């Protein structure tokens, strides 16, 4: 596999270059219209995520079915960590799109969304107080893609070790002590447990919106949702 | 049948 | 605060000394299985383990320094995770089977006796095999279990989350100290540490799914669930 | 609250 022969700097450059673009939403808010804007946004982001996944080193080396499984398990996690990343410099708000920035009061427009909203805000505030770097973020997002669907595999684990090497290589590059390196490595990966929790809460919420038949869901978004039931 | 199959091959 | 002054060996010693016992189920190998009876055996076991987990949590370094409402919250969010990592730990040397109790060893075909179980069962088996391939140590296990208690609810005026993050850092120092003590190189230490904490992401996933299954069993009102188990389950529905 | 009670002991 070509990914294992990459250096740490080559790994950072490969992940930064594959970053998907930031998309816009359609140019006050009900529950049905706010849900439509977000599912429309998520549907267009999924097309770019799949092409981002192809460019994560080591992901092409898996079979087609293994790629489908890793994306099916992790797509909402990847959307969520992308949302909390670009919401960092907006404390107390969620930057879904540059023309779609929401606060907690907007979360109460749709039921059952208050809890997930506050969880996303908390994760974003956590990243802000940790001064998460873009090089660290792209490593964390790739880890989610390869890890979340790994049980549910030896090559994936070798690539996961390679990304851990890259995370440590970035922290020692920023001057952190040996002790600060593994402490920061632990803090970052413990966030991934909560991103998983938020994704599972968000998946149940999307299912109820499918069952309430309130908003039109795309066939692709429905197939990703269907893979979790 | 899986749209995700198509997008991963395009 | 004594927790932030503990050395790595003192941290390991306190966590090992606080371990709860391994309880037995009420399983009778001559009574025939009904999906409701197997559920009753597993929920009876989980209920009795919860009493020991509460007193084990009191003996985790730093946990007492939190307010009573913070302790309640952390246990409410993490109890099934801690039960699960304890299950897969004692099932390590039993490949393809789950040791719920020393007298209750289930394999795959007996999990399908209860509906929706197969997927949770398989993920528990995969987590146990992963621990067995990594040769997870008891000192690493007790560190991981304490991390789940302190971390699983640290998000969902009183900046006591700051004190929790200090205790979590001490446990990370303890994990690294163990791996260096085992001869691992510096690169091997960071990798194994990452490998261990990534498992916790899947234990959260298993707990989220296992909570949905438990709640469905409550609504079907076929298996007697203890009042403590209801309130712990009620804490995730809300 | 049972958990609160047992924790309080
Ligand atoms: C899936 C979801 C709609 C899309 C949302 C979304 C869209 C785009 C994006 O970059 C991130 C997110 C994260 C939260 C997601 C919601 C969580 C629960 C939800 O159903 C709602 C409202
Ligand atoms: C909550 C639960 C019953 C208790 C189980 C249990 C009991 C004791 C323990 O040390 C660990 C676990 C982990 C899995 C738990 C199950 C996950 C889903 C479940 O409802 C079931 C079952 C079943 C029947 C198998």
- CATH number, residue C161: 1.10.565.10
Beta-sheet pairing, C104-107 with A93-97: unpaired
Helix, strand, coil % over all residues of chain B, rounded to 5: 70, 0, 30
Distance, in Å, from the CA atom of A172 to the CA atom of A111, rounded to the nearest integer, reads 44
Shortest-distance Cα residue to atom 17 of ligand 1: A202
| Eight-state DSSP code of residue A3 | G
What is residue D8's three-state secondary structure? helix
Distance, in Å, from the CA atom of C56 to the CA atom of C19, rounded to the nearest integer, reads 7
Considering only the beta carbons, identify the residue of A51, A54, A72 that sits closest to B4: A72
Distance, in Å, from the CA atom of C141 to the CA atom of C116, rounded to the nearest integer, reads 28
The CA A24 to ligand 1 mean position distance, Å, reads 14
Overall resolution, Å: 2.2
Distance, in Å, from the CA atom of C100 to the CA atom of C83, rounded to the nearest integer, reads 10
**A140, A162, A193, A195: which to substitute to probe chain C, counting the most C Cβ within 10 Å?**
A193
Number of domains within chain A: 1
Distance, in Å, from the CA atom of A217 to the CA atom of C35, rounded to the nearest integer, reads 37
Report helix angle C35-58 to C186-219, nearest 10.
Answer: 130
Method: X-ray
Distance, in Å, from the CA atom of A59 to the CA atom of A53, rounded to the nearest integer, reads 7
Per DSSP, chain D holds a count of helices (H) and strands (E) of 1, 0
Chain C residue numbers touching A196 (CB-CB < 8 A): 201-202, 204-205, 208
Look at residues A25, D8, A26 and name the one whose alpha carbon lies nearest to residue C71.
Answer: D8
| Eight-state DSSP code of residue C161 | H
Distance, in Å, from the CA atom of A75 to the CA atom of A145, rounded to the nearest integer, reads 8
Q: At A151, which helix (H) or strand (E)? A: none
| Eight-state DSSP code of residue C188 | H
Could you tell me the residue range of the domain that residue A222 belongs to? Answer: 1-229
Contact C7, C181 (CB under 8 A): no
Q: At A97, which helix (H) or strand (E)? A: strand A93-97
- C144–chain A nearest CA distance, Å: 11
Sequence-ordered strand ranges (E) for C79-185? 97-101, 104-107
């Amino acid at each position: 596999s070509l990914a294992l022969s990459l250096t740490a700097d080559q790994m950072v450059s490969a992940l930064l270059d594959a970053e998907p673009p930031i998309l816009y939403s359609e140019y006050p808010f009900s529950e049905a219209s706010m849900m439509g804007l977000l599912t429309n946004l998520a549907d267009r982001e999924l097309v770019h995520m799949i092409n981002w996944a192809k460019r994560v080193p080591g992901f092409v080396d898996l079979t087609l079915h293994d790629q489908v499984h890793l994306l099916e398990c992790a797509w909402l996690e990847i959307l969520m960590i992308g949302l909390v990343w670009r919401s960092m410099e907006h404390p107390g708000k969620l930057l879904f799109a540059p023309n779609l920035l929401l606060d907690r009061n907007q979360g109460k427009c749709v039921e059952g969304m208050v809890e997930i909203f506050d969880m996303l805000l908390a994760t974003s505030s956590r990243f802000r107080m940790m001064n998460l770097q873009g090089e660290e973020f792209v490593c964390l997002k790739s880890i989610i893609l390869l890890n979340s669907g790994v049980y549910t595999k030896d090559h994936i684990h070798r690539v996961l070790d390679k990304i851990t090497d890259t995370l440590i290589h970035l922290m020692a590059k920023a001057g952190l002590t040996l002790q600060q390196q593994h402490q920061r490595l632990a803090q970052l990966l413990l966030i991934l447990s909560h991103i998983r929790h938020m994704s599972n809460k968000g998946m149940e919420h999307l299912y109820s919106m499918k069952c309430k038949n309130v908003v039109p869901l795309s066939d692709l978004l429905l197939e990703m949702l269907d893979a979790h039931r | 049948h899986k749209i995700l199959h198509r997008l991963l091959q395009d």
